[PDB]
Design an enzyme around this catalytic site. Structure first.
Site, PDB file in Angstrom:
ATOM      1  N   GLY D 113      -5.891  58.839  -0.850  1.00  0.00           N
ATOM      2  CA  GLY D 113      -5.362  59.065   0.481  1.00  0.00           C
ATOM      3  C   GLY D 113      -5.907  58.110   1.519  1.00  0.00           C
ATOM      4  CD  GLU D 116      -1.842  57.830  -1.518  1.00  0.00           C
ATOM      5  OE1 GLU D 116      -1.089  57.941  -2.511  1.00  0.00           O
ATOM      6  OE2 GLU D 116      -2.586  58.746  -1.119  1.00  0.00           O
ATOM      7  CD  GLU D 136      -4.733  58.892  -6.432  1.00  0.00           C
ATOM      8  OE1 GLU D 136      -4.734  57.707  -6.844  1.00  0.00           O
ATOM      9  OE2 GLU D 136      -5.171  59.224  -5.310  1.00  0.00           O
TER      10      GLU D 136
END
Lengths: 266, 265, 266, 266, 265, 265
Positions: D113, D116, D136
Site C-alpha cells: 500500500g 501503491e 503480496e
C-alpha cells in the site's frame, strides 16, 4: 453420443446447418460431455466455409436446454467448479463468434446456460409457450455462461438486473415484450414452431453475398464493443474485404442482366 | 429528519428505505440534504444485512425537484462547479450501492431528482408522477450524471430529445420510453410506486446475498467495457460465490426440496 | 448547383437551418458532387455561430436519399471504391458531429447511405409510408456509411443484424416499432409531413441556452462511447463551460422574476 | 492524533501543502485509523482552493509506508478483509484524483500500500537507498491498493509482472532504472533528501496558472484511460475552461509587457 | 518430437518447458507444429501443478523463424487468412496461459517467432540473438499479434519504425528498446537465455499459486480497460485469494517466522 | 509559399517533404498556415504514389513555436476555442496520414509545434534543438493534442512533470525520456535532423505500400482499444494484403532470389 446432431440441410435449405441437442434424459442440461461435443462441433463449423446460416435448437419437445447439470455439479469439488463453468462460458462465447448468422430456436424451457447459449446467437425466436430465464441467484450463484454480459446488452441494464435479481422465468410473449427474442410464435402440434420460423428466417439469408455477410457480422460484433470512431475504422476494414471479391462484381452483373445473383462466397 | 432511514422488519426484513422528507424545499438537494444523503449511503455501503434498498419521498406529490435553486443563486461561480460535482459524486455512490436499489417515484422528479432515480437499478413510478431534466431551459446541462445515464437507459436519440427539449413526462410516457420499468395508478395515500417497489423488493429477498451483490458488480462493470473483458469480470464474480456456504445450501435445499436458508457467507 | 440547398429560417424559426437534397433525376443519390457539396455545407454550418438546430430533408417527394449512386460506382477502379465509400462514411460522420441538434425528416425512400445519413442525425422523424433499409448484403457488400455501427447502437445488435443479414426494407410504421425513428405519422397531401413535424420539434429547442445545448450534445455523444466513469468526467467538463456564461445568470434571473429567459449564447 | 500531519507551507513555498505520515511504531502501516485520517485529509484537500501542489511524505527517517498493518489483518475474519482492502484501494484512488499536482517523496521503505500510495501520486521522487516493492504474492495474496493496475501502467506490463511474480524489492537506483520513479538522489544527513528534491520540484509548479494546471491534470489522467479521439474531445473541454479566465489574459498581457505573470486562479 | 513438453524436477519442480525441435525448417510455424503447439498449450491451461512455463528452442542458433514460407506458397488466397488467424489465435492462448511465461531467445526469432515471444509475460535473450518483424518486406504485415503486442511492449513510435523498416535487432538492441527485460552473453551450449530463464522461473516458484494466477489476470485484463474498471477487476481477483488455505498459511508463516509452504488451495 | 510540398525523386522517389517556411512568425500556426497545412494534408490523403512523408522547417534553428500569440490576442473568447480546435483537428489529420511520417526537428518546437511532431509516427531531432509544452505558463494547457499524445509517448508521470513545469528540453533530453527516436549533432547547414529523416525515409520505400498503410492502421487503431479488438483489427488489415499482386510478388521475389518490386495493389 448422438446427444448432439449436426445436420447439413439441402435443396431449399442448402447452406443451413442445424445443431440439435438430443438429451431428454437430462433435460438437455450441459453435461461435461455435451459441451465437449458442442465445443467439438463448434470448432468444426468455425472453418466450415459452405455454411451460410446456423440454427441451434432442440429435438426434445418442451425443452431447449435447462442449463448446467445439477447432478454432476454437486459431485464437483470447489476447485473444479470454476474450471467447468468457465468451460461453458468459453464454448458459449465461441458460438457467439461463429462466422455466419446464428439463430436460436426456442420451442421449450431455456434456463441458465440454455438461455445464455441462445443469447450467444445473433437472433432468438421462440414459441409463446416456451419459458426462459436466469435463476442462478436463487441458488446463490450468478449466471456463469456470459449471461451477466449478454442479457444487459440485449434488453438493457435495468431489465436484465430485475430478471437476474428476481431470478424470474419469462414466457415467449414476455420475452418478446422485453426484446429478449425478436419473433414470438404460436406453438404447433409437433412442438417445433420456433424451429420452422428459424428455418424460414434462415432461407431469407441464403441469397446474400457469403463474404459480405461474414464481414458484416464482424463489423457489428466488434464495433459495438469499442468507441464509435474505432468502430467506423473496423467497418472500413470489413468493407475493404468485399471489394476484391467476384461476388461484388457478380452482384452488379446480376442486376444489369436483370437476374438473381449467384454468389459463391468469392 | 430531512432524510429517513428505515430498516423494515418481518416480511420486509432486509429492505431498507431511504426517505427524503424536506416538504419545505420540495425535497431539493440542498447542501444539507446532500451531506446527510452521503453519510447514509456510505453507512449502507458497509451494512451487511441489507438485501435491497428503496429510495422514496415521504412528501406526497414530490419525489425530488433537484438542486436547491435558492442556494444556487447564493453561490459564486467558483463554488458552483464543486457543489454540482458533489451532487454528481453522491449520486454515483448510490449507483454503486452493493445491493439492488429501487426508486419509487410518486411525485415530481426533476434534474438531480430524476438523476438520483437513474442511479437506482430499477425505477417504478405512478402514472401521475412527472419527471424530466429541464437544465437546458436554465442555460445549463444535467450535472448529476443525467447526460450519461439517461442515454444509457433509454437510448441516445430519446435521451437527446428529452434534454434538448427540456420536456417533462408523466408516468405513462416514462414507461413508454423505458425510463421506468413499472408504472401504475396513484392510490389514495399517494404511495403507489412505493407500495409496488416494496412488492418487487420482496421478490429479491429469497436469493443468495453474496451472489446478488457480485451479480450487480458483473452487470454494472461489464456493461462499461468490451464484452470479452466483461466475461472475465463475470468469471471473477462467479468465483466468489463458489467457496460460500450459501452455494452449498442452495444445492442442498434443492436436493431436500425446501426453501433455501441463505445468510450471506 | 441547386442540388443541395441551405435555408436559414428566421423570426420564430430563426436558428433553424434546413438542408435540402434536391436531385430528383438521381433519386438524391450520393453522387461524387453531392457529397462534396454536402461536406462543404456541413463544414460551413460547423462553425456558424447563429445556428441552433439543423433539419436535413429532401425537396423531392417520396425520396429522402437512395444512397450511393450505382451508376458512378459501376465506373470505378477497385482501388477507387474503397476511398470513395470512406468519404461518404466521413462526411456522414461530420454530420453526426454537428454542434447543434440535428433532425432527419424522412418523407421518402432512405436506402444505404441515405438511412446512414439519417442515423447520423440526433433524431429521426418519418412518414408511415416512407421506406428505409440497408440492402448492401444483397449486392455482396456491407453498409459503408457507418450503418454497421449506428444501426446496432440505435435499435440494438440483434435487430440490426436481422435487418442487415436479410437486407429487409421497412416502412415508417415498422421503423417506429423497432425504435429506428422517434416519431411517425401519416403522410399529408404535400408529401412533407415528416418535415412539418421536424420543424415543430426544432422549435421546441429554440428557447434553450445555446451554449448549454451544444455541450449537452457533446457530453452525451462522447460519454456514450466510453466507460460511465469517464463519461461523468466529460459531463463535468462540459457543465463547467456553462458556469461562466451570461445565459446561466439570465436563467436564474428569469426564474426569479418569473419570466421567459432571453438567451444569446454567451 | 498526530499520526497524519498536514502542513500549509508559506514564504517561498506558499501553495505547497505537505501531508506527512507519522506512525513510527507501525512502520507507517495503513491501519484502520490511519486510512480514516488519510481519507479525511484527502477529502478536505480536494475542495481546498489555495493549494497548488501536494507532497506526500513520511515524518519518520528510513520509512515511507510499509503497507497494510499485518497485525490487524491477522485479527480480521475473511468477511472483513475484502471490505477493508477495498477501502485502502478507494482512498489511494482518491489520492490519484487530487486536483493539483502530487509528488511522493520516498525517503525510506515503501511496500505494498505504501508503494501503491506513491503510485497514486503524479510524480515519484526517492532516495537511492530507499527500498520499494509489492511483495503480496509471497503472502499468497495480490497487490490490493491499485498496484496491479498502476505498476504496469507506470513501468510496463512485462517489468510489472516480473516484480509482482517474484515479489522483488528494488532500491531507489533500480527503481529509477525501471522508470518507477522520475528522480533519484543520494540520501542526506537528515534522511529527507527525496523530500527536499520534491519541494524544489514543487516550487517549479507554483508560477503556473492554477486553473490550467488543474484541468491539465484532468485531461491527462482521463484521456489516458480512453481512446485517443475521445481523449481529444476531453482536452477540448478542458482547454475551454481556461478561455474565460482572467489568468489567460494575464498570460498574454505578461508576454506583451515582457514581465512575469501574476495568476490568482480565477 | 517436433514439440517437446517437459515437466522438470528437483529445484525446477513446477517449471514446465515447451521446446521447439524442428531444425528441419528453422522451427518455422508449419501446419503440424501449430496443431501440436495448440494441443500442448490447451493441455497446459488445465495443468494444475505447473507454476511457470518457459518456451524455448532445442535447436541452437534459432528460436523460431515464423510461418513456414514453403507451405505458404502452396496456399490459395482463401486458405491464407484462416491459417494466419489460427496462428494469431494460438499465440493469443499462449498469452493467456494461467501461470507466468518466459520466452528464452537464444536464436533467430522472426515474425511468428517474435510474436510468440511477445505472448509470453517476460522475454530474455542472448545478445547475439536476432529478432524482428520483416513482414512489410514481403508486402504483408505481422499477422500473429505483432502489430498489437509490439507497440504495447515498446511503444508506438519504436514499433512502427521497426515494422515500417522491417528491421532485425540483436539481443543487445532489443534490450535497449525494452523489447526484452533480460539480456546475457551467449555460451558454447547456445542456451544462455534458457539458463537465465530457469533461474528467473525459480524466483516465481515459492509464491502462492492462486495469488500468482489471479495477479496475472488482474494485470492482463486491467491493462486493456480504463483504470477504474481495472481497480474493480483487481478487487474481484483479490477476493479469490481471501478464502484460500494458502492465505492463512502466509499469515501463519509470517507469525512463526518461517518460509510459507503453498499448495494452491 | 509559406508551406512547400515537394515530391522528391531519384532514390528519394515516393518521399514527399512538407516544409514550413514562415520565419516572420517563428513558423507559428497562423490561421493562414493552418488553412494551407490542412489543404496539403487532405490532398496527400489521396496521393496514390507517396510512400513516406517528412515534415520539417525550411527556416534554420526553427521547427514551429506553436500558435501565433499576436493573432490570439486579437481573438475574442468566442473565437479561441473554435480556432484551437481547428489546430487540434488538423494535427490529428496528420497523425492519420496513410503513410509513415517523420518529423525532422532541427529547431525550436513549442506547443502546437511539438504537438504536430507528436502526431508524426517518428521524431528525429538535433541535440541542440529545443522543444516543450509551456502552455501552463500562459495559464492555458496544450490544445493541439499534447495532453493526449505526450503521456502516450513518454508515459504519464513524465508528461505531467513536463506539462506542469512547462519545461523546455533539448534534443539530448528528448532522447533520454523517449520523446524522440533519434538524436543527431546539428550540421553546419542546420538540417541534420532532415538528412537523418530522409535516410530513415529511404529505408521504408522498398516495402509493400499496401502493407505499410494497413500496418499503420492496425497499430494506430489497435493501440486505442482492448487487445482482443486489436487482434481483430490486425486480422482485418492483414486480410487486405492477401488479394494483392504485391504479396504474390514478394513470394516470387524470394523464390527467384531477387529484390521485390512492389507497385501497391
Amino acid at each position: 453420443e448422438d446427444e448432439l446432431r449436426v445436420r447439413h440441410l439441402e435443396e431449399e435449405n442448402r447452406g443451413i446447418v442445424v445443431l440439435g441437442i438430443n438429451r431428454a434424459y437430462g433435460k438437455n442440461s450441459l453435461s461435461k460431455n455435451l459441451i465437449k461435443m458442442l465445443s467439438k462441433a463448434v470448432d468444426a463449423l468455425k472453418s466450415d466455409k459452405k455454411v451460410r446460416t446456423i440454427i441451434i435448437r432442440s429435438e426434445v419437445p418442451g425443452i431447449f436446454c435447462a442449463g448446467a447439470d445439477l447432478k454432476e455439479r454437486a459431485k464437483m469439488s470447489s476447485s473444479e467448479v470454476g474450471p467447468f463453468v468457465s468451460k461453458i462460458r468459453a464454448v458459449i462465447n465461441d458460438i457467439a463468434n461463429l462466422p455466419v448468422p446464428t439463430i436460436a430456436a426456442i420451442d421449450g424451457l431455456a434456463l441458465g446456460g440454455g438461455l445464455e447459449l441462445a443469447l450467444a446467437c445473433d437472433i432468438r425466436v421462440a414459441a409463446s409457450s416456451a419459458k426462459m430465464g436466469l435463476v442462478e441467484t436463487k441458488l446463490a450463484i450468478i449466471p456463469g455462461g456470459g449471461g451477466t454480459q449478454r442479457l444487459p446488452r440485449a434488453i438493457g441494464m435495468s431489465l436484465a438486473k430485475e430478471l437476474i435479481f428476481s431470478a424470474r422465468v419469462l414466457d415467449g410473449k414476455e420475452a418478446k415484450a422485453v426484446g429478449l427474442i425478436s419473433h414470438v410464435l404460436e406453438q404447433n402440434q409437433e412442438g417445433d414452431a420456433a424451429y420452422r420460423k428459424a428455418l424460414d428466417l434462415a432461407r431469407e439469408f441464403l441469397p446474400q453475398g457469403p463474404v459480405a455477410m461474414r464481414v458484416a457480422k464482424l463489423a457489428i460484433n466488434q464495433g459495438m464493443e469499442v468507441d464509435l470512431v474505432t468502430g467506423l475504422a473496423i467497418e472500413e476494414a470489413c468493407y475493404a474485404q468485399t471489394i476484391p471479391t467476384k461476388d461484388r462484381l457478380e452482384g452488379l452483373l446480376a442486376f444489369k442482366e436483370k437476374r438473381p445473383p449467384r454468389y459463391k462466397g468469392e
